[PDB]
Amino acid sequence: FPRVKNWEVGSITYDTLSAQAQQDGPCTPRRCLGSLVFPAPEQLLSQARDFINQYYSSIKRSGSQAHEQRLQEVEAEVAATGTYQLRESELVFGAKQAWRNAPRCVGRIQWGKLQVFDARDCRSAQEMFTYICNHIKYATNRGNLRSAITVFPQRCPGRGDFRIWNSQLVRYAGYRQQDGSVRGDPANVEITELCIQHGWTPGNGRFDVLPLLLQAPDEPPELFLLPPELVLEVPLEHPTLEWFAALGLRWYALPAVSNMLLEIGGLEFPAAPFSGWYMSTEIGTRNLCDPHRYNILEDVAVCMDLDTRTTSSLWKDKAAVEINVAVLHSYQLAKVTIVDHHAATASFMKHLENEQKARGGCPADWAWIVPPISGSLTPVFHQEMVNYFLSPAFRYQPDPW
Amino acid sequence: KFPRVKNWEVGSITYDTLSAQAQQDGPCTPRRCLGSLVFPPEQLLSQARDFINQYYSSIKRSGSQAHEQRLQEVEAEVAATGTYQLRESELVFGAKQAWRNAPRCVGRIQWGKLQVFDARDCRSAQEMFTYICNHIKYATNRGNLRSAITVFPQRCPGRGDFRIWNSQLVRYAGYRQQDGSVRGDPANVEITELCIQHGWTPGNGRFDVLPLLLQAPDEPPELFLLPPELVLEVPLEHPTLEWFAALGLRWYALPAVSNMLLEIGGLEFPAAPFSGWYMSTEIGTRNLCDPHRYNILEDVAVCMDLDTRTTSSLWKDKAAVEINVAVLHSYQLAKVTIVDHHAATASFMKHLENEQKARGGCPADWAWIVPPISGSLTPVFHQEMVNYFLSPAFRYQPDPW
Numbered sequence: 001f002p003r004v005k006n007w008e009v010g011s012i013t014y015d016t017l018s019a020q021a022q023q024d025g026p027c028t029p030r031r032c033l034g035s036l037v038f039p040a041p042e043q044l045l046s047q048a049r050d051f052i053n054q055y056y057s058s059i060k061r062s063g064s065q066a067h068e069q070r071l072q073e074v075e076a077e078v079a080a081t082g083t084y085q086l087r088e089s090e091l092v093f094g095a096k097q098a099w100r101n102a103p104r105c106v107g108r109i110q111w112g113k114l115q116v117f118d119a120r121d122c123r124s125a126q127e128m129f130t131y132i133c134n135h136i137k138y139a140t141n142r143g144n145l146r147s148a149i150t151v152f153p154q155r156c157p158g159r160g161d162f163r164i165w166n167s168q169l170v171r172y173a174g175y176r177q178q179d180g181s182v183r184g185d186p187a188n189v190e191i192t193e194l195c196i197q198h199g200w201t202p203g204n205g206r207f208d209v210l211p212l213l214l215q216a217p218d219e220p221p222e223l224f225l226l227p228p229e230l231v232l233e234v235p236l237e238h239p240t241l242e243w244f245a246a247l248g249l250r251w252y253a254l255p256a257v258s259n260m261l262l263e264i265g266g267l268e269f270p271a272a273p274f275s276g277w278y279m280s281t282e283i284g285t286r287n288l289c290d291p292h293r294y295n296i297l298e299d300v301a302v303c304m305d306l307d308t309r310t311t312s313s314l315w316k317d318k319a320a321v322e323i324n325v326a327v328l329h330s331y332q333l334a335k336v337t338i339v340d341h342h343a344a345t346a347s348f349m350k351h352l353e354n355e356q357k358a359r360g361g362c363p364a365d366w367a368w369i370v371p372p373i374s375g376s377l378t379p380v381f382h383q384e385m386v387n388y389f390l391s392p393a394f395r396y397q398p399d400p401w
Numbered sequence: 402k403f404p405r406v407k408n409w410e411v412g413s414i415t416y417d418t419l420s421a422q423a424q425q426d427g428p429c430t431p432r433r434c435l436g437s438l439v440f441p442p443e444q445l446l447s448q449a450r451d452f453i454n455q456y457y458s459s460i461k462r463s464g465s466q467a468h469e470q471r472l473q474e475v476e477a478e479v480a481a482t483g484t485y486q487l488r489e490s491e492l493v494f495g496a497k498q499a500w501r502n503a504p505r506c507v508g509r510i511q512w513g514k515l516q517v518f519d520a521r522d523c524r525s526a527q528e529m530f531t532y533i534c535n536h537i538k539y540a541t542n543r544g545n546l547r548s549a550i551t552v553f554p555q556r557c558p559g560r561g562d563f564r565i566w567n568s569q570l571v572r573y574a575g576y577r578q579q580d581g582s583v584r585g586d587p588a589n590v591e592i593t594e595l596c597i598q599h600g601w602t603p604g605n606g607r608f609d610v611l612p613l614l615l616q617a618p619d620e621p622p623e624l625f626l627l628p629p630e631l632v633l634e635v636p637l638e639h640p641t642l643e644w645f646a647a648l649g650l651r652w653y654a655l656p657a658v659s660n661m662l663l664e665i666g667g668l669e670f671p672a673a674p675f676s677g678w679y680m681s682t683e684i685g686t687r688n689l690c691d692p693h694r695y696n697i698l699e700d701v702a703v704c705m706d707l708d709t710r711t712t713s714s715l716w717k718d719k720a721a722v723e724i725n726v727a728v729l730h731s732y733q734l735a736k737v738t739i740v741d742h743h744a745a746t747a748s749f750m751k752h753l754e755n756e757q758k759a760r761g762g763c764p765a766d767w768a769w770i771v772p773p774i775s776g777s778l779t780p781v782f783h784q785e786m787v788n789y790f791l792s793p794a795f796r797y798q799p800d801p802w
């Protein structure tokens with residue numbers, strides 16, 4: 001059992017939970033690959049068997065009547081159908097566990113507070129769109145954001161997958177330019193090209209909300225415009241740098257990851273978008289300052305009259321700090337939930353302590369938990385972590401195209 | 402089986418074929434990643450053969466002349482005596498490769514310019530002290546810092562061991578109180594008490610330079626007062642924050658790691674202090690702002706009149722940047738070689754490209770390469786990395802008690 005040390009405090013714990021790591025990651029004793037971004041009824045049976053055990057442990061009825069009844073039921077159903085169906089409570093628990101188990105989520109103190117919308121009866125792309133709008137509207141909640149997931153029909157034999165082609169419910173267009181560059185968000189060049197290819201009349205701003213490409217089984221993807229009044233955005237201003245609002249920068253309220261696969265007891269839900277609220281560094285640092293994203297850092301530093309001709313002035317660090325300040329201030333001003341990296345990392349530390357008592361550890365991806373600015377200023381920096389894959393889980397999956 | 406390594410800023414792809422060598426085994430298994438953890442007879446001929454084979458390939462002398470010959474004399478040396486002495490150039494080429502191989506060192510673009518002081522004919526702590534004092538003064542070089550390593554005698558059975566008891570050659574004192582807390586540096590507190598244990602007059606201050614506990618084989622350590630004019634220090638002031646100097650902060654010029662164990666061709670040098678120059682964030686972020694080090698962050702933020710009542714003011718971030726600005730500014734005013742984390746990671750990205758062409762990859766510990774502030778503002782953040790143990794190497798070793 002890996003011994004884990006907190007270097008800021010001296011704390012020591014052992015991650016007994018890591019021994020239950022089912023699926024396997026990319027590292028070997030020869031070489032660590034932790035920093036990489038992207039790391040049969042019998043086996044369906046034992047995954048299902050394991051999850052059902054989990055579910056019944058969680059309701060304090062392990063080994064009971066209902067427990068072994070469900071095991072037999074599930075085995076029987078897999079024998080007769082090659083698959084099985086989750087009960088609603090099992091689904092709700094499975095979706096919460098998936099979040100709980102997500103090693104790159106610093107917001108997992110909230111894992112228990114998750115609104116699960118059962119959309120497993122969804123029938124078409126059009127019903128899928130309606131479910132998604134209700135998700136966005138519920139989650140956005142006029143700026144007082146609520147964590148939610150909508151679970152669309154599971155992968156099953158004989159039929160294609162429901163898929164959301166968009167990587168998030170809210171993304172901004174990225175238009176490749178005349179002069180080879182990108183107007184708007186460069187992370188979204190491909191999906192934007194796809195949207196046009198599927199009949200979207202493009203805009204040409206930098207914060208053009210993308211339409212949804214929604215794929216029903218054995219269907220081509222279908223284009224759906226989000227109603228503007230459903231997409232709550234936050235124009236970005238700075239509490240003190242008044243020229244900051246003249247940048248015309250905006251970000252949207254709702255972070256809803258929509259391209260990931262939800263895995264519960266061997267069952268696969270290729271379409272299950274989930275949403276929480278942002279940590280300010282995702283917007284302030286990554287989305288806006290990443291060289292390959294909005295890349296505003298030099299424009300901000302020049303405006304701030306920093307000396308951008310030498311690195312030792314720390315103009316990058318200073319412009320980024322203020323960009324994060326603007327994000328926090330703007331979202332607070334707009335009354336849209338947001339958590340700064342100091343609050344978030346502190347609550348994640350409480351999550352780690354809660355998880356150690358409850359489960360004997362917690363899967364955590366240090367490189368993803370430590371915020372991209374001010375890393376060692378947050379407590380998670382000095383906390384060793386064990387990264388491993390627990391199921392239920394959100395997993396990456398290839399793009400549908 | 403050759404890890405695809407990607408840079409997400411540029412989209413460029415490489416493969417780490419060098420990982421295929423990994424002589425020792427790291428702490429990760431397919432089941433759990435432990436990459437974030439700080440501290441994770443004639444076997445000697447295998448490591449000796451291998452090292453000599455490297456040496457001769459690197460001078461384009463694979464399979465020729467003194468290659469075969471030197472292979473015999475190590476054979477015969479171990480055969481006769483149970484060990485061997487390195488040819489002077491080998492001691493030099495292994496010293497450089499060990500630095501070249503250090504996954505956690507961001508400054509390895511300098512791996513080829515290293516001054517190796519051969520202290521292998523050392524005997525007694527009075528001999529070490531002048532070897533160390535020669536190093537220190539050579540390396541300090543009036544602030545024009547020069548990478549150096551003094552290699553003390555290798556390890557043999559039946560005899561004791563050369564060990565420097567301090568983690569660095571220059572460490573500040575840390576004294577406890579009538580209220581438990583520490584005046585000075587809490588990272589040293591332990592070695593500070595051993596110095597007082599072995600008869601050192603404890604200073605009062607928050608930056609008393611610790612003496613040296615030097616240990617010749619099978620002898621108790623001997624305290625040594627470092628020559629004060631030999632300990633180059635930089636008082637810290639800020640270019641525009643006039644009161645910063647009044648905080649009485651200082652740091653030493655020379656970062657000289659004096660507790661690690663150099664391992665070349667299977668030989669083990671438990672005293673081989675290496676030194677280079679500081680990256681500013683080591684001092685400004687970790688040494689001064691870590692809660693368990695000097696923990697000055699709030700003091701500086703009070704002085705800057707920042708809103709420490711909410712974390713979303715990013716007062717920690719702002720104060721931290723200025724402390725780094727002061728460190729850079731102070732070192733450049735005293736004309737002491739320092740490198741900001743942007744210049745350093747930029748040069749490390751150049752090092753990676755070099756090592757790709759040269760050795761087909763490079764062992765890099767992402768969590769240690771990415772700086773403790775503004776991580777994603779530096780290019781290494783967006784650079785996937787493969788971590789693995791190559792030989793020769795600097796290794797951690799137990800405290801000599």
Ligand code: HEM
Pocket residue numbers: 095098099102104105106107108110114147148149257260274275276277278279282339344368394
């Ligand atoms: C409520 C507040 C939440 C906060 C503050 C938060 C925070 C974060 C952050 C900062 C990341 C890293 C994303 C990046 O840097 O690209 C992340 C990733 C992730 N989160 Fe959370 N999150 C929240 C809610 C949720 C919810 C509701 C779920 C699932 C039901 C979830 C599951 C995940 C997953 C699977 C990832 C990895 C996604 C990826 O690799 O792109 N999170 N979270």
Ligand code: HEM
Pocket residue numbers: 496500503505506507508509511515548549550658661675676677678679680683740745769795
């Ligand atoms: C000359 C410029 C150099 C720079 C800018 C530099 C920078 C750094 C930094 C920032 C670290 C991280 C250590 C920490 O944060 O605690 C590090 C670690 C390390 N470096 Fe370098 N370094 C330099 C020279 C050297 C030399 C000359 C050697 C050996 C001959 C070396 C070998 C190592 C080793 C073994 C570590 C890991 C030590 C530990 O675990 O505390 N470096 N370096």
Ligand SMILES: C[C@H](O)[C@H](O)[C@H]1CNc2nc(N)[nH]c(=O)c2N1
Pocket residue numbers: 035036037367368369409782783784785
């Ligand atoms: C290459 C590198 O591992 C990659 O850029 C990662 C590092 N850590 C991260 N951490 C978070 N939270 N989000 C990210 O997108 C990344 N990107």
Ligand SMILES: C[C@H](O)[C@H](O)[C@H]1CNc2nc(N)[nH]c(=O)c2N1
Pocket residue numbers: 007381382383384385437438439768769770
């Ligand atoms: C817990 C964590 O692994 C530990 O604090 C590491 C992280 N990265 C680091 N990186 C550097 N350069 N130096 C350090 O001391 C650390 N500490």
Ligand SMILES: Cc1cc(N)nc(C#CCN2CC(F)(F)C2)c1
Pocket residue numbers: 107167168255256257258259274275276277278279282
């Ligand atoms: C639920 C949630 C909350 C949050 N605070 N952040 C995220 C995120 C993210 C990662 N991004 C989206 C992608 F494009 F898929 C990669 C997700």
Ligand SMILES: Cc1cc(N)nc(C#CCN2CC(F)(F)C2)c1
Pocket residue numbers: 508568569656657658659660675676677678679680683
């Ligand atoms: C050669 C070198 C250069 C540099 N720029 N940094 C370091 C360092 C370090 C690690 N610190 C010192 C300790 F106390 F041993 C832990 C070492």
Ligand SMILES: [Cl-]
Pocket residue numbers: 255282287
């Ligand atoms: Cl995002």
Ligand SMILES: [Cl-]
Pocket residue numbers: 656683688
């Ligand atoms: Cl240091």
Ligand SMILES: [Gd]
Pocket residue numbers: 240241242
């Ligand atoms: Gd102003």
Ligand SMILES: [Gd]
Pocket residue numbers: none
């Ligand atoms: Gd004042």
Ligand SMILES: [Zn+2]
Pocket residue numbers: 027028031032033034429433434435436
């Ligand atoms: Zn690993």
